[PDB]
From a paper:
The closely related inhibitory killer-cell immunoglobulin-like receptors (KIR), KIR2DL2 and KIR2DL3, regulate the activation of natural killer cells (NK) by interacting with the human leukocyte antigen-C1 (HLA-C1) group of molecules. Central to this process is the interaction between the killer cell immunoglobulin-like receptors (KIR) and their cognate ligands, human leukocyte antigen class I molecules (HLA-I). While the KIR2DL2/3 receptors share ~94% sequence identity and segregate as alleles of a single locus, they are inherited on different KIR haplotypes, which has implications for NK cell function. Here, we determined the crystal structures of KIR2DL2 and KIR2DL3 in complex with pHLA-C*07:02, which showed that KIR2DL2 and KIR2DL3 engage HLA-C1 with different docking angles.
Next, we next determined the crystal structure of KIR2DL3*001 in complex with HLA-C*07:02 bound to the RL9 peptide. The KIR2DL3 ternary complex was determined to 2.5 Å resolution. Overall, the binding of KIR2DL3 to HLA-C*07:02-RL9 largely recapitulated that observed for KIR2DL2-HLA-C*07:02-RL9 (and other KIR2D-HLA complexes). KIR2DL2 and KIR2DL3 adopted highly similar hinge angles of 77.7° and 77.1°, respectively. Specifically, the structural differences between KIR2DL2 and KIR2DL3 centred on the twist of the D1 and D2 domains that differed by 13.3° for the D1 and 10.4° for the D2 domains. The extracellular domains of KIR2DL2*001 and KIR2DL3*001 differ at positions 16, 35, 148 and 200. Here, Arg16KIR2DL2 reached across the D1-D2 interface adjacent the D2 C-C′ loop binding His146KIR2DL2, while Pro16KIR2DL3 made no direct interdomain interaction. For KIR2DL3, there was an additional contact between Asp72KIR2DL3 (E-F loop) and Arg75C*07:02. For KIR2DL3, unique contacts were formed between Phe181KIR2DL3 and Asp183KIR2DL3 and Arg145C*07:02 and Ile142C*07:02, respectively.
Numbering used by the authors:
A (entry chain B): 0 to 99
B (entry chain C): 1 to 9
C (entry chain A): 2 to 278
D (entry chain D): 5 to 81, 86 to 117, 125 to 142, 147 to 166, 176 to 195
Amino acid sequence: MIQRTPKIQVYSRHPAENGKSNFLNCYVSGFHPSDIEVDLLKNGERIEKVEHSDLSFSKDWSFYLLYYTEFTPTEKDEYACRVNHVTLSQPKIVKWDRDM
Amino acid sequence: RYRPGTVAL
Amino acid sequence: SHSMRYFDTAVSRPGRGEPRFISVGYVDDTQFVRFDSDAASPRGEPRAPWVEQEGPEYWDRETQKYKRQAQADRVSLRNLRGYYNQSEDGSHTLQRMSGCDLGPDGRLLRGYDQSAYDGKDYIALNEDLRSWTAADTAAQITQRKLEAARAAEQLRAYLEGTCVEWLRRYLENGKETLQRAEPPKTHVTHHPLSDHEATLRCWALGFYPAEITLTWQRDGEDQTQDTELVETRPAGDGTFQKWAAVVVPSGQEQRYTCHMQHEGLQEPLTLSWEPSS
Amino acid sequence: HRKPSLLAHPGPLVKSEETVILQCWSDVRFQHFLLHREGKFKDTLHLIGEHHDGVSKANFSIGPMMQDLAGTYRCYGSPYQLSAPSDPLDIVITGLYEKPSLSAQPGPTTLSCSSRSSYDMYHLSREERRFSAGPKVNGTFQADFPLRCFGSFRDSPYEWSNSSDPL
């Protein structure tokens, strides 16, 4: 039994322009097994309509997934991604820095 | 086009 | 040169139903098909428009193959739990990669059917499409059953025939999206880190396929040993993103350039942080 | 509370995809029948009782014969109160591997079933009996019955390889 911890990336589909529409994305990759809990956060509050890609994996057999949602960013609005996995003792929070 | 059926492992 | 790959994941969940079987299909970096044994009515669905116009007779056949594969992978998970003398209460994973690699000439470059158990290589069809390679002594049992069942013949014929043909057809019917260059849109951002330090981030956005290389170079030195490189992300619309960051001394950034090679370009790009003024 | 009869129609050895029927019946008039498979995949099926000519019968259709459907079956004849288990019925699936070859020494009418696929066991039948193969020098594996054949692997003694040449 091998276990890999996920790598997490919070980012928007396009560079954020205030008032313009965009997609919020959390990309989880390089993990094993495939059981993973990923939620998106507006004001640290969870988000309802969060879709995800179909479970696929890489040539080294590690899994990856894209969780995403529609949003329109604001100067004062904030967004994060929480990920829980057996490799983790407590879920990781990764905030959306529009410069990353 | 998916591969055809095979006996289990 | 192109590719078609099917990625399968079977996860056993002992006290909570049959193992979940998921299979997704790709032509190069473009998914076109999907199957999920947990959906309301499990059926192979299209995910790229160049397979939507295939007849219902096509999707019914693919769905039958998928259901049968779900059953056979349930059985395989059971057999491997037996082979390793493992408890009937643990969750275990069985993965498969199958499909065909097409050379620049369209002829079969490589046929694949490989399988991993709990993320570890288990058994793989060899490139001659006639033999197997088993990773341990439990996989030797699977090798003997596979041989006695003439599995390498059916697989060799699928790979040499149906796989390559239908990949050629997929490639023609989506010639534009699939065989298009599609280079990345670029720019360089500057971010103050602290007194005497600041970060230069080099962006490549909206490119297909996913293969790309960006490297930071101060004047001449290749700071990959110091470059922060994220793995390539899906932008969400079938295209990909990537960036590379270097921590530099404040007021010394003009020495730095970002060098970016990709398929959709000829001259490898070289761009620097340009403030607008 | 009297064990019933479990009979495989049209026989205990099924070919893949071929639906086969398990008949459980007794002159005891249970209104419920429970069929239990032990093996690779344990399972239990419920048919309601049928009454005809003084026998309660139950026709368990087990469908497109797969690997997960092989095993050892019993059936039990008031939903809670069940009978003594019937005599066990080993139901095997056939049609998974290459069929072996039957040589004999000397007469045609010390047998042998041969293939270079290293089966772990071999089997027989008429309209059973077993023996495990022993390899040799020319790259083949062999078992022979002192005095129709099948092959099988050690971990699954209910999944057999293909109906060999009749004799």
